[PDB]
Symmetry: D2
Subunit: 247 residues, 4 copies
């Protein structure tokens, strides 16, 4: 009901948060182009959900695959309303001595260059429509340390800067750019229930997906430039002091 | 719908943003008690809105009125799910030479002390329930200067500090706390002249970064609905700006070089 | 001697951070008016330091006392170059059920209302001179929760907002306004406290004292920061940038 | 003389802000290794200044040169106290349609990958010394839009993220990590005087160097994790609104 008639591309959408966002976008009447490099998962999901969900293989590090992905969406569906640049790779907390220059440049290619390209070509076709919404997947590590590795946090910080620069530029054309910075997805929930600030609730892929839905829906028509954290308050506190003197 | 069976108290709900949230919360099936000091506006709206909408006069600077507001709401409905601490007064851009120690202490009492009290007694009844959501109305001036007066911006900065410390404290009980920072909504700030309205909105469209839509009270209401909905079940500690990116840009540099 | 010929007023300057900044400003050649309400401590410091240090009793809650403080500094010294609004009262981490409306309004008067007044009358004499620097004492609690109480946290946040609008307004007259946000709970803290320092401080091997915070104010007030305005400069050893819970549960 | 006996490496130190910091570091009694790829400027500068200023050519995108830059510096002077990771390239305000994947990757290598490497090998040799300070040159564009290009802005956000996670990790070894984010230093002064928020004063390289001196001095012994802006308040205001309502 909320996304009726809208066309959304979700890179990295064959699995996890992107797949949860694809299904929820499908439930709200959006035509969704699943983009990923896991072709069996992507094709299986796009067929199971039905006629308005297609799949397109797209390694986001190849600008030509990306340009073609958006161009196939405009030809097939008339245009692109939503670009959910979610394709990335994740590393947990590490040390600066664990950073390998080739691993670093690879992560930067998927995480930062991939977001750059997915934005450029979403912007390429959105600008003439004088409509459009771009949502990147950052990470809660954009507002606190100790929950991701050095290469990962820096790539996600760069997405936030890209998101704000796109919000100002594409704002003149009625186009919004936003981030969602989730906290903990990929025994594991027991560890999450111990570290979360907001106790009781566990963070799931749909939880992040319904937040992307908000940012992409007309309900957030005036939300732009925003890196919306979904962390249950994890990033606003350093409990070390309180633990040493109250526990 | 999204708020069905939930009980929300909305301070400042007799006009503007608070009233738009009352109507929207009402449309989504919540029991809503309008809390305000404009008694004609507040009472008439709650009666016209219907059965699930009550009114309670409450000057938020008076802790006894605030304690009573929540206590009678708990008696009427069993508990409080949502507290939208929205009551406030606004100052436009001014000079530090215009601040009068009384006008400042008055501004602080309504905006910041009211925010503390509305949260204190909302937590009083929410903590035992192990459930609840508290939402404060801050201001876009909490992330940029040049769009509000000194006392007003300082009160809203203090609301943000309060929101984040409540997010940590009440988080142990499954209770969420968040802010909304709107950017110039046509409201009880602006008088009722259609002229005074079209001019406020027209300049807001000029100064706005995101062109092609105007920001209204209902737009802010739908974000409060999001923040209070279970759809934001893991969103806490956040000051969500609704400004179309106004606070992320200083266009002076680019303007000077397009000569 | 970085403050040669400069005249600085330091509210709350009879003790702690304010006293360390008065001494350091004195060492750098500034004429300093100590402003406080601890008259025993306040007068003793201004006399012991020497000829360029006077004292002026001033409750920052009283606009007439503060208006006199600035007017006396102008009378004795020609003008005001630096206003260090340091006067405040402190709360550690607490619960919102511990907040008393009268105690809240008292803290707000000293911490926030006082900062406004010291700025209004510092601006009063700085603007016609088309120069001046106003520095507030905020707190590291302005960037993280859990290291100050609700009332204290909100008052220092309000100082940060006040500082930024003054930075915009007073910038047009060549006047800079900045905050310093120390890690107050850890400043100048026995083997109990030494154990707590190692556990809670992020930058290990070092300790924060009042003298350390004074030199950051010296930096912020000197000409070394001629283009530094609008800044909330933390002196916290990086405490506010990390939530170590996650790695802690998974390293055990 | 605040830096007596301290050893500083300054990448990008043959010109601009890096050269200004080299001279000031020289005046405060530091041994400085000028690191740059402008060999004529860099070698001439290191010779003019004297005994305590040497030169080392170093492309920061080449980890082997960077690993060598630190190792030759430790060999010559005993250790590295200050690492001023200043080497970078600049992009002005532009459009997302102007970003070319190869220019994007080139800028990213110099600005961000250089920052990772320069910190990694400074961290390599600082950690055993249980002392040390790393200072990155970020940018005012990390706190406001409209004053730099998309690729540059994202690279500088990434430096800030790197700095924050390094501040947490290397803090355990008594090592500090901070940024400096200057505004307009790289006809011209009239534009700066009318775009600046703090009127009456103009920002120069000498100004940024003394802020770097502060951050590198022991006067800042408990400052870590900070991105210190030197912008005269430019990033804290959007004056568009007040302009329209004043005349
Ligand atoms: N309208 C804008 O442009 C804008 C922009 C940013 C932030 N805000 C914030 O939105 C908040 C809500 O105000 P609004 O914009 O909806 O205008 P409004 O005047 O229409 O509504 C504010 C309500 O608070 C009530 N109020 C004043 N003092 C009170 C007290 N002691 N106790 C209880 N209620 C009291 C008023 O009666 C009013 O019904 C304000 O706190 C304001 O700071 C507004
Ligand atoms: Cl009324
Ligand atoms: Cl900002």
């Amino acid at each position: 009901r909320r996304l009726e008639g809208k066309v959304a591309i979700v890179t990295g959408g064959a699995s996890g948060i992107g797949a949860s966002t694809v299904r929820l976008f499908h439930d709200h009447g959006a035509k969704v182009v699943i983009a990923d490099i896991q072709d069996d998962l992507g094709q299986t999901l796009a067929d199971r959900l039905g006629r308005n969900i297609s799949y397109t293989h797209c390694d986001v590090t190849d600008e030509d695959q990306v340009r073609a992905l958006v161009d196939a969406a405009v030809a097939k569906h008339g245009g692109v309303d939503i670009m959910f640049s979610n394709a990335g790779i994740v590393e947990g907390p590490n040390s600066i001595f664990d950073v390998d220059k080739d691993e670093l440049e690879r992560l930067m290619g998927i995480n930062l260059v991939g977001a750059f390209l997915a934005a450029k070509h979403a912007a390429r076709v959105m600008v003439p429509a004088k409509k459009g919404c771009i949502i990147f997947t950052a990470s809660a590590c954009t507002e606190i340390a100790g929950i991701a590795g050095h290469s990962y946090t820096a790539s996600k910080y760069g997405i936030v800067g890209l998101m704000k620069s796109l919000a100002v530029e594409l704002g003149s054309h009625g186009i919004r750019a936003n981030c969602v910075s989730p906290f903990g997805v990929l025994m594991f929930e027991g560890i999450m229930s111990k570290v979360g600030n907001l106790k009781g609730k566990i963070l799931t892929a749909e939880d992040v997906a319904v937040t992307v839905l908000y940012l992409a829906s007309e309900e957030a028509s005036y939300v732009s430039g925003v890196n919306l954290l979904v962390d249950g308050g994890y990033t606003v506190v350093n409990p070390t002091f309180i633990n040493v003197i109250t526990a």
